[PDB]
Write an enzyme that holds these catalytic residues in place. Structure first.
Site, PDB file in Angstrom:
ATOM      1  N   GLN B 172       0.817  -1.223   0.000  1.00 13.50           N
ATOM      2  CA  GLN B 172       0.000   0.000   0.000  1.00 13.50           C
ATOM      3  C   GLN B 172       0.848   1.269   0.000  1.00 13.50           C
ATOM      4  OE1 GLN B 172      -4.065   1.579   2.267  1.00 13.50           O
ATOM      5  NE2 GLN B 172      -2.626   0.195   3.295  1.00 13.50           N
ATOM      6  N   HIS B 176       1.214   3.924  -3.257  1.00 13.25           N
ATOM      7  CA  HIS B 176       0.574   5.217  -3.062  1.00 13.25           C
ATOM      8  C   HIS B 176       1.488   6.404  -3.392  1.00 13.25           C
ATOM      9  CE1 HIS B 176      -3.056   3.307  -1.896  1.00 13.25           C
ATOM     10  NE2 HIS B 176      -3.512   4.260  -1.101  1.00 13.25           N
ATOM     11  N   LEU B 353      -6.092  -2.229 -11.204  1.00 11.62           N
ATOM     12  CA  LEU B 353      -5.768  -3.629 -10.933  1.00 11.62           C
ATOM     13  C   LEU B 353      -5.026  -3.809  -9.614  1.00 11.62           C
ATOM     14  CD1 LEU B 353      -3.235  -5.392 -13.364  1.00 11.62           C
ATOM     15  CD2 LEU B 353      -2.587  -3.771 -11.579  1.00 11.62           C
ATOM     16  N   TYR B 354      -4.566  -2.702  -9.051  1.00 10.85           N
ATOM     17  CA  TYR B 354      -3.759  -2.762  -7.850  1.00 10.85           C
ATOM     18  C   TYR B 354      -4.599  -2.521  -6.588  1.00 10.85           C
ATOM     19  CZ  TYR B 354       1.180  -3.361  -6.778  1.00 10.85           C
ATOM     20  OH  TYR B 354       2.380  -3.891  -6.356  1.00 10.85           O
ATOM     21  N   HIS B 357      -7.181  -4.744  -1.674  1.00 13.05           N
ATOM     22  CA  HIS B 357      -7.924  -4.800  -0.425  1.00 13.05           C
ATOM     23  C   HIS B 357      -8.156  -6.215   0.119  1.00 13.05           C
ATOM     24  CE1 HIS B 357      -9.060  -1.067  -2.629  1.00 13.05           C
ATOM     25  NE2 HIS B 357      -8.633  -0.551  -1.489  1.00 13.05           N
ATOM     26  N   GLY B 495      -0.416  -7.444 -14.780  1.00 13.92           N
ATOM     27  CA  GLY B 495       0.273  -6.775 -13.677  1.00 13.92           C
ATOM     28  C   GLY B 495       1.757  -6.581 -13.918  1.00 13.92           C
ATOM     29  N   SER B 499       4.184  -3.186 -13.639  1.00 15.46           N
ATOM     30  CA  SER B 499       5.163  -3.192 -12.558  1.00 15.46           C
ATOM     31  C   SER B 499       6.632  -3.081 -13.005  1.00 15.46           C
ATOM     32  CB  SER B 499       4.964  -4.402 -11.647  1.00 15.46           C
ATOM     33  OG  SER B 499       4.145  -4.019 -10.564  1.00 15.46           O
TER      34      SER B 499
HETATM   35  C1  HEM Z   1      -6.885  -1.314   6.124  1.00 17.62           C
HETATM   36  C2  HEM Z   1      -6.159  -1.016   5.044  1.00 17.62           C
HETATM   37  C3  HEM Z   1      -6.762  -0.326   3.796  1.00 17.62           C
HETATM   38  C4  HEM Z   1      -7.775   0.548   3.765  1.00 17.62           C
HETATM   39  C5  HEM Z   1      -8.587   1.083   4.966  1.00 17.62           C
HETATM   40  C6  HEM Z   1      -7.994   0.945   2.397  1.00 17.62           C
HETATM   41  C7  HEM Z   1      -8.954   1.835   1.997  1.00 17.62           C
HETATM   42  C8  HEM Z   1      -8.990   2.496   0.797  1.00 17.62           C
HETATM   43  C9  HEM Z   1      -9.747   3.703   0.508  1.00 17.62           C
HETATM   44  C10 HEM Z   1     -10.647   4.456   1.525  1.00 17.62           C
HETATM   45  C11 HEM Z   1      -9.535   4.029  -0.772  1.00 17.62           C
HETATM   46  C12 HEM Z   1     -10.119   5.243  -1.527  1.00 17.62           C
HETATM   47  C13 HEM Z   1     -11.524   4.939  -2.031  1.00 17.62           C
HETATM   48  C14 HEM Z   1     -11.874   5.882  -3.161  1.00 17.62           C
HETATM   49  O1  HEM Z   1     -11.159   6.910  -3.326  1.00 17.62           O
HETATM   50  O2  HEM Z   1     -12.864   5.623  -3.907  1.00 17.62           O
HETATM   51  C15 HEM Z   1      -8.631   3.038  -1.322  1.00 17.62           C
HETATM   52  C16 HEM Z   1      -8.158   3.003  -2.600  1.00 17.62           C
HETATM   53  C17 HEM Z   1      -6.988   2.403  -2.954  1.00 17.62           C
HETATM   54  N1  HEM Z   1      -6.350   1.384  -2.248  1.00 17.62           N
HETATM   55 FE1  HEM Z   1      -6.785   0.584  -0.310  1.00 17.62          FE
HETATM   56  N2  HEM Z   1      -7.083   0.272   1.609  1.00 17.62           N
HETATM   57  C18 HEM Z   1      -6.305  -0.521   2.434  1.00 17.62           C
HETATM   58  C19 HEM Z   1      -5.275  -1.351   2.036  1.00 17.62           C
HETATM   59  C20 HEM Z   1      -4.736  -1.345   0.770  1.00 17.62           C
HETATM   60  C21 HEM Z   1      -3.811  -2.301   0.200  1.00 17.62           C
HETATM   61  C22 HEM Z   1      -3.248  -3.541   0.932  1.00 17.62           C
HETATM   62  C23 HEM Z   1      -3.551  -1.917  -1.061  1.00 17.62           C
HETATM   63  C24 HEM Z   1      -2.629  -2.631  -2.082  1.00 17.62           C
HETATM   64  C25 HEM Z   1      -1.461  -2.114  -2.471  1.00 17.62           C
HETATM   65  C26 HEM Z   1      -4.305  -0.709  -1.328  1.00 17.62           C
HETATM   66  C27 HEM Z   1      -4.304   0.009  -2.498  1.00 17.62           C
HETATM   67  C28 HEM Z   1      -5.180   0.996  -2.893  1.00 17.62           C
HETATM   68  C29 HEM Z   1      -5.019   1.797  -4.089  1.00 17.62           C
HETATM   69  C30 HEM Z   1      -3.855   1.699  -5.097  1.00 17.62           C
HETATM   70  C31 HEM Z   1      -6.225   2.745  -4.131  1.00 17.62           C
HETATM   71  C32 HEM Z   1      -6.570   3.824  -5.188  1.00 17.62           C
HETATM   72  C33 HEM Z   1      -5.683   5.046  -4.983  1.00 17.62           C
HETATM   73  C34 HEM Z   1      -5.950   6.162  -5.971  1.00 17.62           C
HETATM   74  O3  HEM Z   1      -6.702   6.005  -6.979  1.00 17.62           O
HETATM   75  O4  HEM Z   1      -5.374   7.251  -5.731  1.00 17.62           O
HETATM   76  N3  HEM Z   1      -5.014  -0.390  -0.191  1.00 17.62           N
HETATM   77  N4  HEM Z   1      -8.317   2.113  -0.345  1.00 17.62           N
HETATM   78  C1  IMS Z   2       0.148 -15.902  -9.697  1.00 22.41           C
HETATM   79  C2  IMS Z   2       0.517 -15.886  -8.238  1.00 22.41           C
HETATM   80  C3  IMS Z   2       2.023 -15.869  -8.002  1.00 22.41           C
HETATM   81  C4  IMS Z   2       2.732 -17.010  -8.739  1.00 22.41           C
HETATM   82  O1  IMS Z   2       2.733 -18.190  -7.902  1.00 22.41           O
HETATM   83  N1  IMS Z   2       2.464 -14.530  -8.411  1.00 22.41           N
HETATM   84  C5  IMS Z   2       2.853 -13.951  -9.558  1.00 22.41           C
HETATM   85  O2  IMS Z   2       2.961 -14.460 -10.660  1.00 22.41           O
HETATM   86  C6  IMS Z   2       3.144 -12.492  -9.291  1.00 22.41           C
HETATM   87  C7  IMS Z   2       3.867 -11.636 -10.302  1.00 22.41           C
HETATM   88  C8  IMS Z   2       4.923 -11.962 -11.138  1.00 22.41           C
HETATM   89  C9  IMS Z   2       5.581 -13.293 -11.271  1.00 22.41           C
HETATM   90  N2  IMS Z   2       5.227 -10.847 -11.799  1.00 22.41           N
HETATM   91  C10 IMS Z   2       6.212 -10.812 -12.761  1.00 22.41           C
HETATM   92  O3  IMS Z   2       5.972 -10.813 -13.959  1.00 22.41           O
HETATM   93  C11 IMS Z   2       7.651 -10.792 -12.451  1.00 22.41           C
HETATM   94  C12 IMS Z   2       8.175 -11.475 -11.372  1.00 22.41           C
HETATM   95  C13 IMS Z   2       9.533 -11.427 -11.142  1.00 22.41           C
HETATM   96  C14 IMS Z   2      10.336 -10.706 -12.013  1.00 22.41           C
HETATM   97 CL1  IMS Z   2      11.822 -10.629 -11.804  1.00 22.41          CL
HETATM   98  C15 IMS Z   2       9.790 -10.039 -13.099  1.00 22.41           C
HETATM   99  C16 IMS Z   2       8.437 -10.089 -13.332  1.00 22.41           C
HETATM  100  C17 IMS Z   2       4.455  -9.806 -11.489  1.00 22.41           C
HETATM  101  C18 IMS Z   2       4.356  -8.473 -11.867  1.00 22.41           C
HETATM  102  C19 IMS Z   2       3.392  -7.642 -11.286  1.00 22.41           C
HETATM  103  C20 IMS Z   2       2.515  -8.125 -10.327  1.00 22.41           C
HETATM  104  O4  IMS Z   2       1.574  -7.305  -9.739  1.00 22.41           O
HETATM  105  C21 IMS Z   2       0.613  -6.541 -10.471  1.00 22.41           C
HETATM  106  C22 IMS Z   2       2.622  -9.458  -9.946  1.00 22.41           C
HETATM  107  C23 IMS Z   2       3.588 -10.286 -10.525  1.00 22.41           C
END
Ligand code: HEM
Ligand code: IMS
Ligand code: HEM
Ligand SMILES: *[C@@H]1O[C@H](CO)[C@@H](O[C@@H]2O[C@H](CO)[C@@H](O[C@@H]3O[C@H](CO)[C@@H](O)[C@H](O)[C@@H]3O)[C@H](O)[C@H]2NC(C)=O)[C@H](O)[C@H]1NC(C)=O
Ligand SMILES: *[C@@H]1O[C@H](CO)[C@@H](O[C@@H]2O[C@H](CO)[C@@H](O[C@@H]3O[C@H](CO)[C@@H](O)[C@H](O)[C@@H]3O)[C@H](O)[C@H]2NC(C)=O)[C@H](O)[C@H]1NC(C)=O
Ligand code: IMS
Ligand SMILES: *[C@@H]1O[C@H](CO)[C@@H](O[C@@H]2O[C@H](CO)[C@@H](O)[C@H](O)[C@H]2NC(C)=O)[C@H](O)[C@H]1NC(C)=O
Ligand SMILES: *[C@@H]1O[C@H](CO)[C@@H](O[C@@H]2O[C@H](CO)[C@@H](O)[C@H](O)[C@H]2NC(C)=O)[C@H](O)[C@H]1NC(C)=O
Ligand SMILES: *[C@@H]1O[C@H](CO)[C@@H](O[C@@H]2O[C@H](CO)[C@@H](O)[C@H](O)[C@H]2NC(C)=O)[C@H](O)[C@H]1NC(C)=O
Ligand SMILES: *[C@@H]1O[C@H](CO)[C@@H](O[C@@H]2O[C@H](CO)[C@@H](O)[C@H](O)[C@H]2NC(C)=O)[C@H](O)[C@H]1NC(C)=O
Ligand code: BOG
Ligand code: BOG
Ligand code: BOG
Ligand code: BOG
Lengths: 553, 553
Positions: B172, B176, B353-354, B357, B495, B499
């Site tokens: 997260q 962000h 895609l990221y 949650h 993904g 990435s």
């Molecule tokens: C308890 C922990 C978490 C809470 C409370 C939470 C909550 C939220 C909230 C409130 C939003 C904004 C909703 C909106 O704007 O419509 C959001 C969006 C988002 N969340 Fe989570 N989240 C959590 C954990 C995570 C995790 C583990 C990830 C994975 C990396 C993540 C990635 C994101 C991303 C990338 C966005 C959109 C950001 C953007 O568009 O600027 N969050 N989340």
């Molecule tokens: C399917 C569940 C397990 C497999 O048991 N995980 C993955 O395959 C996750 C994964 C790999 C392998 N990615 C590479 O393509 C990757 C991994 C390593 C290197 Cl060095 C380069 C690319 C991702 C790139 C981005 C990503 O998030 C959006 C996840 C991944």
């Protein structure tokens, strides 16, 4: 003690780094040299250096023996060299960029704050003994004097290659896309984000401004009708910041996207040319694409002209400048084999080196009439009284100053050249000879060697005390020319890499962009490919006059 | 008539272009296919396609037979594949970028207005019959219901690969940096210019903000001392826009560079980790470089951490995610042979895609204590009461949701997933199956084929009417997983490219940047190269706890 870096110890692009209280180290990573200063050559480097001919020799090969070149041009070798030219030259420029006025070291800020020019060599550290490193006097030659003596036009020296005012103004117009040094932020900073051929002098450097210029119907730019002829609109129909003499600021006043073109008639001329182009293009899109929105018609016309600009620049502009027999070729597919970054960032040294004022003549001839500078500068009516055809004809026929060689700026614009030297000193630009090194050349050992003539040599020598301490801008304009060239060795070799990287580093050159689709199909694509100064003129006029980057016969 | 492009006729990345009143054409330039729709393969393409194994098969090869991989890792093949992985994967992403929310066609604005996310496929044209092309019902499944039914956590499904909350939060925090969707401008737009690993969540997304955080002595970031422990400063010592509950907004309140981290304790945790890192680094520079200014010490520490981030991300983060036996390797020199653009621009689909949650658990265990969501969200004191060591230990030990597979978001955060589907619909994102195609996969022919289970299949089928009309975000989280994976086929393959392009497209990976000099010498350079989650923790703590992206045994 002395900042060790003031000696510029690290050679061949090695990076000087201060250590402890008073030590330094060089970063020779990927310089092809190793050792304390990066002067012990690698196996291949050493083969290259021995087998490298001089810049002069190459120049000679290119300017001589058309028999061989008529054959070369006719075959693929034309593309082989064009590729070579593109890759070896480009490569001498950092991509992504390196420094700016604030950081003399790679940084995130310097990478991401697009408001700066970059720089190719760092600054003279603030803490050095002499104001330019380790040699020269304390004070430097008085700007004013330096120009008076060596850059002030005696009699008019015409460019030996037939270069005309029709070229001169294009040169100015074009460059002023990406030279927009900021008033407010000061030297080292630029309004012209985009940092390339974005046409932000037609479309404005901001969206708010661009939005004032757009007609918003069929994706056209606003305009006005004077004598049955199309011209840019007035600020009454297009409010937007334009520097102009307060006096007749409504009608008579015009707006264009570069807030400075209002001034000289030749600027407004090209502004008119390109605007007529924009709309003419739209017409041909809307033909093909009835369903298309205004936004699409606009963005696409833009791309056409951007492409069209770069073709003409390379295959007409630089062709004429270079006097080459190798026929230059604009073709992005040439670089798809290579490793090239499709991004550009305008350097300050580039800013500095493109001050081609010497091109400007003693007066401006328009057929029978002959206009003083006094009469020409700011002439609000001259464009519309004469008509683009008659003005193109005019500029196409009048010469222009041998840029290099010295003593060739007309006294009116001489203060510009003075300011350039002044800001050079503000930006802490390294010694000329250090730039010679960084662009592959050997540094000069005498002033007599710089410009092959004793009088200016000994007089400079006395003024500067040392060739190493010779400044950058003076260096460029005082250096001897090759035989019958517009400028000398150092201008070409420092100019080229910047120019080509500016042109080909444009995203539209990218594999990702360079498709028929991107210019809305074949009619679009071929408009770019078959582009021509003569077309950009005559297709937009009722009459077709003399139009060329060189004077007739 | 119907906009022809609503059928998505052009295959294999060919660009649909409307012509005349009702016609289209494809731009198959460089697709490896020719013909009306880009479906007649070129000589080599056809060899590749026959000889391409399935994504599933490769996945199996990588997750199986350590005997072969222990050998591979030990040799250079580790680098050969790492390179392969890097080039083939990267390549599926447009560089320079293509579209955005306003333009469904390359444009100068879309190229240069860095305020937009980009997009990989265009929008569903506004003029199409069904809201997602040509198939499905008129109305789409009611967001709320769709999540209630298929994304709402029944019982907790732990990630089968041992992934922990220590990972979850890093995920997260990290993301962000480059997901900062704009409140004011709305969906499609981003505050996080820089569009990559700039660390603009430590340093702020603007210079004015960054300037509030800098101590300006020895290039350190401001901080405060609570219980003999270092933490970010309060807004009393660092005024700057931070979203927080009004209530105790002075002390207790903290500022970090990402205006949202104030919320969850795990965010502030990592913010503390990296800040301690920044200053610890400076200390080691000032040691080496007494003469260095505060500005230099700052910019350089930054670069170290940026590099350090990317090493850990690749060699620890993605390593753990992928469960690969191939040991991933962060080494930019791998790409110097290749044709790679060192620039990145965050796509919306990536944004979409990221949304991981599902990783988030039912409650938060800190040794004996067990904190409700109610207790954890906004907990102003939890970080400072417990101490980073004890909190790292805590997160490192608690599991996390199998992201894909469905029915696995805890009800507290479920509305986020709802909003994601809502904006998906605002952004006019193409059908899931169209994205499958664009990322090399074959489109699904049934819902039963999507998630290998009849109940959800037939129920989805009824709701959406057609697999082609299945949306993007639902698609990603409902798809079946590979055996014992955190997510399924489509997540990996869409993904990865984003990435890796995010990571390696960073300028510091460039030949031009990737030198000892750039990180102020060998101590800097080796800090990047020997980086480790465990180091980033223990070097900055008095005690060293359990720290890992997976739960013990
Ligand atoms: C308890 C922990 C978490 C809470 C409370 C939470 C909550 C939220 C909230 C409130 C939003 C904004 C909703 C909106 O704007 O419509 C959001 C969006 C988002 N969340 Fe989570 N989240 C959590 C954990 C995570 C995790 C583990 C990830 C994975 C990396 C993540 C990635 C994101 C991303 C990338 C966005 C959109 C950001 C953007 O568009 O600027 N969050 N989340
Ligand atoms: C399917 C569940 C397990 C497999 O048991 N995980 C993955 O395959 C996750 C994964 C790999 C392998 N990615 C590479 O393509 C990757 C991994 C390593 C290197 Cl060095 C380069 C690319 C991702 C790139 C981005 C990503 O998030 C959006 C996840 C991944
Ligand atoms: C009669 C015609 C010309 C006049 C009156 C003129 C005058 C000027 C003036 C007043 C300045 C600004 C001085 C300063 O800011 O210190 C300037 C700078 C400049 N000139 Fe010329 N010039 C002319 C022709 C040309 C030509 C032929 C070129 C070559 C392409 C050129 C290129 C430039 C550039 C690139 C700058 C600096 C721009 C910046 O930093 O933003 N000009 N000139
Ligand atoms: C990147 O693009 C966005 C959106 O195109 C730019 O923001 C927007 O700019 C426009 C014009 O500046 C604003 O439009 C509005 O239109 C009316 C038409 O008459 C105008 O007069 C109003 O004043 C009004 O502003 C718009 O509000 C603004 N906001 C957004 C997000 O739409 C943005 O400026 C661009 N970024 C850069 C740095 O160029
Ligand atoms: C790119 O960098 C320039 C220069 O670093 C940025 O402009 C400058 O921003 C700073 C801070 O925003 C201003 O500094 C001044 O310092 C005092 C210190 O207390 C501050 O409190 C004052 O308010 C004052 O603004 C400075 O005025 C401003 N102007 C310049 C050109 O120096 C610019 O913001 C950066 N560009 C982007 C888009 O990040
Ligand atoms: C010395 C006087 C005559 C020669 O008789 N002119 C030139 O050599 C001008 C010239 C060439 C040849 N440049 C190329 O390197 C160049 C030319 C053509 C192609 Cl295709 C590519 C590069 C320049 C790049 C930039 C530039 O302004 C800063 C001038 C030049
Ligand atoms: C690299 O350059 C440095 C500094 O320019 C050299 O130090 C100089 O040594 C030369 C000749 O040995 C003398 O002219 C000076 O006394 C030194 N100048 C300074 C400023 O220290 C250094 O010798 C070079 N490196 C090596 C080992 O060849
Ligand atoms: C700017 O140029 C205009 C038009 O080119 C000047 O007006 C003309 O000048 C010529 C000779 O200089 C004369 O024949 C007339 O006085 C004008 N044209 C005709 C035939 O009517 C004008 O004087 C110039 N103004 C400035 C700024 O000097
Ligand atoms: C490329 O795709 C288009 C549109 O998807 C094809 O047009 C369709 O033709 C197929 C089979 O021939 C039919 O299912 C439909 O009647 C057509 N649909 C539409 C929307 O026009 C087109 O045939 C394809 N190109 C070629 C020549 O193979
Ligand atoms: C936020 O967390 C803090 C500290 O982690 C909570 O205070 C502690 O809660 C535990 C059990 O929940 C109890 O032992 C004490 O009441 C507190 N710690 C001790 C030992 O003194 C606080 O209640 C939480 N606040 C919120 C937002 O719910
Ligand atoms: O022959 C070439 O002739 C040129 C022009 O005379 C010289 O400048 C070169 O040095 C020489 O190699
Ligand atoms: O042409 C060659 O191109 C190279 C790249 O600019 C230069 O370094 C050489 O000096 C020049 O002769
Ligand atoms: O063997 C592989 O086994 C995998 C896992 O069972 C399958 O998904 C692949 O399709 C198959 O090729
Ligand atoms: O790994 C391979 O990498 C390629 C690039 O992402 C994909 O297109 C293939 O489907 C995948 O199996």
């Amino acid at each position: 003690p002395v900042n060790p870096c003031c000696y510029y110890p690290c050679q061949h692009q090695g990076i000087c780094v201060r250590f402890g209280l008073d030590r330094y180290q060089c970063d020779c990573t990927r310089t092809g040299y190793s050792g304390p200063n990066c002067t012990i050559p690698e196996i291949w480097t050493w083969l290259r250096t021995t087998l490298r001919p001089s810049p002069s020799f190459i120049h000679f090969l290119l300017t001589h023996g058309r028999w061989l070149w008529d054959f070369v041009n006719a075959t693929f070798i034309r593309d082989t060299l064009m590729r070579l030219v593109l890759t070896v030259r480009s490569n001498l420029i950092p991509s992504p960029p390196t420094y700016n006025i604030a950081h003399d070291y790679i940084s995130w800020e310097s990478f991401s704050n697009v408001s700066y020019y970059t720089r190719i060599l760092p600054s003279v550290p603030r803490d050095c003994p002499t104001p330019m490193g380790t040699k020269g006097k304390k004070q430097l030659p008085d700007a004013e004097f330096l120009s008076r003596r060596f850059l002030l036009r005696r009699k008019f020296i015409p460019d030996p290659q037939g270069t005309n005012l029709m070229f001169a103004f294009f040169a100015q117009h074009f460059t002023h896309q990406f030279f927009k040094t900021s008033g407010k932020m000061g030297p080292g900073f630029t309004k012209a984000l985009g940092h390339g051929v974005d046409l932000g002098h037609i479309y404005g450097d901001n969206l708010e401004r661009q939005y004032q210029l757009r007609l918003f119907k069929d994706g056209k730019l606003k305009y006005q009708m004077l004598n049955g002829e199309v011209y840019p609109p007035s600020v009454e129909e297009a409010p937007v910041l334009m520097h102009y003499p307060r006096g007749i600021p409504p009608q008579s006043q015009m707006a264009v996207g570069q807030e400075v073109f209002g001034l000289l008639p030749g600027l407004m001329l090209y502004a008119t040319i390109w605007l007529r182009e924009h709309n003419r293009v739209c017409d041909l899109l809307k033909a093909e694409h009835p369903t298309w929105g205004d936004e699409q018609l606009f963005q696409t016309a833009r791309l056409i002209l951007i492409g069209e600009t770069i073709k003409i620049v390379i295959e007409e502009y630089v062709q004429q400048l270079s006097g080459y027999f190798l026929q230059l070729k604009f073709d992005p597919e040439l670089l798809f084999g290579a490793q090239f970054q499709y991004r550009n960032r305008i350097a300050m040294e580039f800013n500095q080196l493109y001050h081609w004022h010497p091109l400007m003549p003693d007066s401006f001839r328009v057929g029978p009439q002959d206009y003083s500078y006094e009469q020409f500068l700011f002439n609000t009516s001259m464009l519309v009284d004469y008509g683009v055809e008659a003005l193109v004809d005019a500029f196409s026929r009048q010469p222009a100053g041998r840029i290099g060689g010295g003593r060739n700026i007309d006294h009116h614009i001489l203060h510009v050249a003075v300011d350039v030297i002044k800001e050079s000193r503000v930006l802490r630009l390294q010694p000329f000879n250090e730039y010679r090194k960084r662009f592959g050349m050997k540094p000069y050992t005498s002033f007599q060697e710089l410009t092959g003539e004793k009088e200016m040599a000994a007089e400079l020598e006395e003024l500067y005390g040392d060739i190493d301490a010779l400044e950058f801008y003076p260096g460029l304009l005082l250096e001897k020319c090759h035989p019958n060239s517009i400028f000398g060795e150092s201008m070409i070799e420092m100019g080229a890499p910047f120019s080509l990287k500016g042109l080909l580093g444009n995203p539209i050159c990218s594999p990702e962009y360079w498709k028929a689709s991107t210019f809305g199909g074949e009619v679009g694509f071929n408009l770019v490919k078959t582009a021509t100064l003569k077309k950009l003129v005559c297709l937009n006029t009722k009459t077709c006059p003399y139009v060329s980057f060189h004077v007739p016969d």
